[PDB]
Amino acid sequence: KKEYTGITYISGPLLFVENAKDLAYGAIVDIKDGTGRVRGGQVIEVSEEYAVIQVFEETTGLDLATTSVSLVEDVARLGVSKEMLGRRFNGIGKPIDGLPPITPEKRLPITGLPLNPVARRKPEQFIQTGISTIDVMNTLVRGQKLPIFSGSGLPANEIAAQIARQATVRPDLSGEGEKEEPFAVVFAAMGITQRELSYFIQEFERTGALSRSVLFLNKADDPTIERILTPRMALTVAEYLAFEHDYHVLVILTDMTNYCEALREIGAAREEIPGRRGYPGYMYTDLATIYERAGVVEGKKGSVTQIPILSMPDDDRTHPIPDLTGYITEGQIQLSRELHRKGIYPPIDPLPSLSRLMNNGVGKGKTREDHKQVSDQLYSAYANGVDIRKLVAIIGEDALTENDRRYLQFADAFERFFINQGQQNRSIEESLQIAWALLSMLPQGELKRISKDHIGKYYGQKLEEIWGAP
Amino acid sequence: NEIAAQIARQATVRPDLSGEGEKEEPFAVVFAAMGITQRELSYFIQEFERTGALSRSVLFLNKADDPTIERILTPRMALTVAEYLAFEHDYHVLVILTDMTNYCEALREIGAAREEIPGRRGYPGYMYTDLATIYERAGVVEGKKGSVTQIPILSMPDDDRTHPIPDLTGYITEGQIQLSRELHRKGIYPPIDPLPSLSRLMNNGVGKGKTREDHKQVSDQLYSAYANGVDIRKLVAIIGEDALTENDRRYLQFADAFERFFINQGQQNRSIEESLQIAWALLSMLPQGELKRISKDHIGKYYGQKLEEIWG
Amino acid sequence: ESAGELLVATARTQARGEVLEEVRRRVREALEALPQKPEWPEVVRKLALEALEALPGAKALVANPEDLPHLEALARERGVELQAEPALRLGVRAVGAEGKTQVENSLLARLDRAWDALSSKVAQALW
Amino acid sequence: TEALLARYRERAEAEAKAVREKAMARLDEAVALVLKEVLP
Amino acid sequence: IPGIRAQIRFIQQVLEQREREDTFRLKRIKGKIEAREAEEE
Amino acid sequence: MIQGVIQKIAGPAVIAKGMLGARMYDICKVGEEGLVGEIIRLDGDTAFVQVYEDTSGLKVGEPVVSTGLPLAVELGPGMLNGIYDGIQRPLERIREKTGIYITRGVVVHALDREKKWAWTPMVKPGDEVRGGMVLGTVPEFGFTHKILVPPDVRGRVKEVKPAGEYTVEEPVVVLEDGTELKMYHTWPVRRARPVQRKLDPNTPFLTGMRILDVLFPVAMGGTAAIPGPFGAGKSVTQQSLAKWSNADVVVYVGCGERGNEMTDVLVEFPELTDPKTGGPLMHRTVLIANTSNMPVAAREASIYVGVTIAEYFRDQGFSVALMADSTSRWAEALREISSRLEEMPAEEGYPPYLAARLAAFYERAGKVITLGGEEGAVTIVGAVSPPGGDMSEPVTQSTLRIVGAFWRLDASLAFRRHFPAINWNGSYSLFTSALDPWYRENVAEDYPELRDAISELLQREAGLQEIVQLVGPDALQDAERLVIEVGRIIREDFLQQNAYHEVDAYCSMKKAYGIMKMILAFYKEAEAAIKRGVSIDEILQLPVLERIGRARYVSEEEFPAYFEEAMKEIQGAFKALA
Amino acid sequence: PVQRKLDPNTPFLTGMRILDVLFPVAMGGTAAIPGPFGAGKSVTQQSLAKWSNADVVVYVGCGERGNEMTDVLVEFPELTDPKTGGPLMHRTVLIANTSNMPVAAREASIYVGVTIAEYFRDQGFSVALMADSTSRWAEALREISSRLEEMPAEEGYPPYLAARLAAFYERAGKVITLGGEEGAVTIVGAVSPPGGDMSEPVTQSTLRIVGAFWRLDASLAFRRHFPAINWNGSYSLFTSALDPWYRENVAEDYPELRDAISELLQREAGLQEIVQLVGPDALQDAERLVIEVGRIIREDFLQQNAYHEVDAYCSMKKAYGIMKMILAFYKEAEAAIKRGVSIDEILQLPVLERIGRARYVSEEEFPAYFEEAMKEIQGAFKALA
Ligand SMILES: Nc1ncnc2c1ncn2[C@@H]1O[C@H](COP(=O)(O)OP(=O)(O)OP(=O)(O)O)[C@@H](O)[C@H]1O
Ligand SMILES: Nc1ncnc2c1ncn2[C@@H]1O[C@H](COP(=O)(O)OP(=O)(O)O)[C@@H](O)[C@H]1O
């Protein structure tokens, strides 16, 4: 429609356009040059004299004589529909699977309105992830924000794919329940490479998990503003589904470190003085606006659950990114380099991990009544086992008592059978059975943290229940 | 300064070993001083007069009371003269630059006056390029007889190897000779610490037909043995010396003897043959099976002789 | 298994995409058939009037020389100037007073900018 | 089995042809509606 | 333990000082840019 | 009202021109949607307004209007039983008229303008009124709300409305100057409300917990700090303080909590029961709620809004308990705001004026004589949650420099099922000596000496831990095993207090005095018996141990008989023993 | 442009045992090698140029010494192509922008090299691209930004440094050419952090996009232990995808041997924490055996001489044989110490020197040496009984 041709300055990612006071702040524009190619851009500052536009991609062919700028949209919006399930997008809503575009039921602003605190309710139901070290000891509750802390060489992508493939609800354990409750997975990847992109595509298509999933994939060579936009679009779709069609959505964010770095670059490009250690001052508020979009709402049947994934920059928990993610999320799951190098997958370390909402999603009427005590006993026993393992290197095996030797054997069996489950999908009952089989190695009466009725009901099973087909 | 003067006094090629044209051309010295004090300058002048080397020397003197900004020009003038002499009159030129630290200080003054983007600790961002424009003017050119060899001298501010000046210099140059304050405090001269030192062009000029066939393996074995000795020195500071095994005691004794006999020579001129003999005498302390880096032929040829046959 | 259902679903989606793109081609043919019919003066005059309303401080009116005689009535009414230009057909462009801003009211532009909303409605019309 | 996959493919082809004919049954009305809405 | 703790605190102080100096430099250069733009165009 | 137009937009910062006459830190409405913001800089004919919500979609040329007043709260009837955000916006009515989301530019009133109130005058025409006096009363649940003249209003009463039903808007009193006085008035949140005189810390703040009331007491009008380790039962202690303290009104402020934690606190309180009346506890509380994704300015102003409301209720003549949760989050918001203004940081990135702001917040507490001549007090208990439990954080360092007490809540004790899980080795209190005369005159003249003896026993028990660690406890001789056992008895029977029990949840000072007397008497008799030559295992099976242990669970009125019976049995059992 | 990207399933045989075994890199993958000055980046890159199995090698000397380019120019014509048999220089392209050359050409040299590599890939070859230092490119960008008077980020670098690095590194991969052929580009880039600080922005940006990471240690370089790879800090994400190729071309149990070696190294690293506290003599005999086996692995398998006439290159089968010998000796020693044979006597067994010196055996003499050494391993412990 209406175009502006008064370009007066082009440098780096920015260009200035004169007599453009009709452009709203934050608007999305299209930039066309003499060759007819069109680029994207966002308005970052509007004045009476000129407007400043941050250009996506690159400014190679631009010139001050032939370039023109045209408006696209006042506010960034996304078109959503229930037909998005089974589709892949590039991070700004553009399809990349070769299928025709969807017809939106409505168009919603990607930035979200905060939930009213009086409209929320307490999370009270769990999600079966199929991984024993998460289901039993760090249970994920519907409406929680439980991030995963990983390192540079650890296999976080494999764990993300496995959880996305295996996650499900268990209505039968909640009294009678309803056998039909919709479940969906929203997957958002930021700054991934071609290899990771191919791996994710293959994993989602080879097992049928694509039919219930919406994928937003953003590559490492894509513009950084698209990386900024990707999680917000994913969460917009998730909120729409959950709170308009009563879906139980699970959102996975592949790497928030890439998001933080892109945010830092964007802030530096707009001439803003950085805060602590070079990161933007408003980093906490931005991460809060992302994370705090999950939960359960009173009077609604849907829910949103988030699992952020981030690589600790130098295996340091003091770094601003993990530290600020800790302030906003409820617990964390931390991977161990030692377990990974020992050949154990998934390399989840129970001792530094923690789930802060676990106590509300377990018990009677959900999972089983022995869940909490079994988890506590496993934690204490594993801690004792690792301590005795450290001591036996010096004082030798013969100098240990019988209980200490039993604890050491328990720790080895725990590492070999409970943590190292491979690609196997375990229901919660299977994990509880394996936990009781491991606890049976310890003598009865050493189990301080379990009540007598549970021991009488479950103690006494042999490890061959799982050792036969681990 | 003492080490630089000694190197300039004793430097010589060995044509008889390499079989090249037996000639005795003396080095020409180009001496550039930047922010030098009167004490050091007088020492250098007296040393050159004593050795009689002033007639072959060109001196560019910028004392500490001279203007600071003049230091931007001194290394370039010295290197221009050196290049002219070497590549148009077939001289073999040795260049000594007294303190690149003062050069970097002048560079930082100018950069801060111009509101440049600093690197680390306020030094300008183009300091790497500026230093490369100076260091990279040495070398040899095909079809010509002359050569330019550089021995820059710089002071690490707090003995901190990670300071920008030593860091960039190490990233540009082709090795470094690092001095140790611990060795100096023990009375060892020259206090050259072998572990942090490095010579990138060492493999080009050593071996059979250049110095001797056992040179590289002897050097590697000495390095490994000294590292083991230093680690055991660290260990005895915790578990006490009486708790050592016999092997660790042997390595500790080797490290002590190395520091007291190989590094510490004083003001004496050792030929390469003497140095190799001393190195073999030191290596003979260790059991023959501990010399993994050396081939059995060389061990059979040289191992066994004791240190007392040299001194005592 | 569900793989055959996936084939059915993707075939349905591809058929719907073919349907919509063929509809788009027929619509574009019908729109480009307008300049050969006596109905084009009224629509181009209305589009030019809307474009001039879009720029309150518009200075000049610019179109292909075929339409300038029809736009002379608005040029004398609104007081703007007229100059020929081999620009896109089925639309009239205007130039602001400053010479920096510029509006365009091509019919293909309206089709491109309205098809996003029209696709959802015509999906019901087709089925 | 391959026979079931062939049956699914034939069913998809038949349904796609039927949907194509159904769309052809209303192409004129859709074109007229689009032309009516696009015009001022 | 106390010696390593003191060394850690010293290194933290040094890094924080360097960060503060960097922030000061950035503020000065941004002030220069803004002043030049708003005064000379 | 000063009215201008938008000139430049860049993020939340908007530059408006034509605003000559606008005043610094006034609240302005930006754009056609009326987004609120603050003026932070004036320059010539322009003004720099910074908006709270996002500014996407705004255009140059939209109107900007200035209200002419700084950030302020409305003080009057209708605040009790209410839930507010950081800038006093009623969340319930926003939910009613907007849905589950908080859309931008919503307009609601802090006090309902439609509810009728039972006015009851207390003045007559011709009377002279000064700021702080009582004009009339209105029943608000179990309270009698006193309509106070604003602190800066003086004049003579001209007309008074008769008793009846009115909203908060009808002018009930009009002065000879023509000034109209309504049931409410507004007050800036950053200016402390005036008083006549600040009294001394002479009376205690009874929390109902034995450990806090005895070992680490806090005076009425004092200040305290408490850490926030996970799993330590901080919320249980906070709601126990709300239920059982001698405060008349409770103000709870959550400035930056997580979403689910705010959900827990917003769901639990409407279920608690007020012990004094049996009705809901919510009828005497005000809740200020803020999650992490709410605007930064609200999170920064939440504590000031809370303390201003507390000061108002103090001026009415009550005693108010103010609980601020996670002041670390408030400090984080302050740091972000300072960063947006490009200020040079100090220490760990915080602004150099962090300590000044913390002192300004904490120093509004104290027992005062109100302008009406009555007595009122405000007590502040602020929670501090360091990044990793490190006490070297600048926030914690500046907080511990001004508070009067510090109750180091510990997670290790909670792991061992010791509740309340308060570590008595790291805690301290600076109010004991000042409160001593009140104890001597109100509970007993011997109480301070008994408390010091109990603390000495605890310290002596703590001193023996190295030997018990290195050598098994059974190897120890009698004189040390006795002190170990009496310390264990103290921990199990006096320090611990079950908050879910019907009668153990609340304990008076005299009950604590009796329990301490019994424990000290038993220890003294056991020491005498040990000096006489009896075996310790003989002492460990005396019938008096159960009598001491069950002293917690006896009723309050039934206590004195039980106390004297056990004191008699203390001598009865030991004289039978050799 | 290309037609389609492909998954990597074929190793890039560098010729170094540690890189080829512990931290493999696929044909179309990317790798990085950071370290301080003196660590051995340039020697490693020249060794990869000499001994790798790529069809064409493109070497980019961005902002480094001219003597290195001179050494390459003088030596490469006299060497032999490992596969073709012709002169080594006939398969090599050099782009040189030395330290004292103009700064603005440092950015251009990287693009020129990658474009030439992509062209040769489009022809249907497998190309290996060696970037001598990307830190010089970053410094040149910083200098130009300083001239522009821009707002810096982190240590003065321009904000778009990470975007530029990602755009450069994403050009690698195994593809289907527009002509229907198949080719690949492998990128190995060296990093020069200031002061060896791995927290520097360029190194952190490189961490997030490479598939393999080879960290160098200054402590190992000081004691002249080369290639001086920090095993605790290095990793490789291509290990799982290359397993079928190893099973088909090296040995059916090769991944198991590699896993055993990795487990032994990790156990040795764990025990060294106690060793640094109480000393080796405080440990039990099994722990001492683990420590000694770790030392043997460090000194006789990971160590490799770049200038030795035979140790310079190593095949996959030679490494497999050495690993098999080490594992067999470890099993025998563990069995012997389980029945009470002292460890302090085992360390003087004569076959230890044979295991240690098996590196220098020729590639064709090796299998007989391996058979004799395995039988001698069996005999040295069977003769004890
Ligand atoms: N004073 C008390 N009396 C009785 N039980 C208590 C008391 N304090 C804590 N508990 C018990 O111990 C638990 C403490 O652990 P929990 O994590 O649930 O605490 P919380 O009150 O939610 O606080 P926080 O947020 O610090 O974890 C309480 O839930 C309760 O069961
Ligand atoms: N594999 C190796 N074998 C022998 N010597 C090596 C090896 N790797 C490095 N070196 C030595 O290390 C020195 C450092 O040189 P270089 O490899 O250029 O390091 P960088 O480029 O990391 O500074 C070289 O001169 C060489 O002497």
Numbering used by the authors:
A (entry chain D): 5 to 474
B (entry chain F): 161 to 472
C (entry chain J): 61 to 187
D (entry chain I): 81 to 120
E (entry chain G): 169 to 209
F (entry chain B): 1 to 578
G (entry chain A): 194 to 578
Task: Share the article's original sentences.
Cryo-grids were prepared using a reaction mixture of nucleotide-free V/A-ATPase, containing the regenerating system and ATP at a saturating concentration of 6 mM. The reaction mixture was incubated for 120 s at 25 °C and then loaded onto a holey grid, followed by flash freezing. We determined three rotational states followed by focused refinement using a V1EG mask for each state. In these structures, nucleotide densities have been identified in the three catalytic sites. Hereafter, we refer to the structures obtained at ATP saturating conditions as V3nuc. The V3nuc structure, obtained under ATP saturation conditions shows all three catalytic sites occupied by ATP or the products of hydrolysis (ADP + Pi). In the V3nuc structure, where nucleotides are bound to all three AB dimers, three distinct but associated catalytic events occur at the three AB dimers simultaneously and these events are coupled to the first 120° rotation step of the DF shaft.
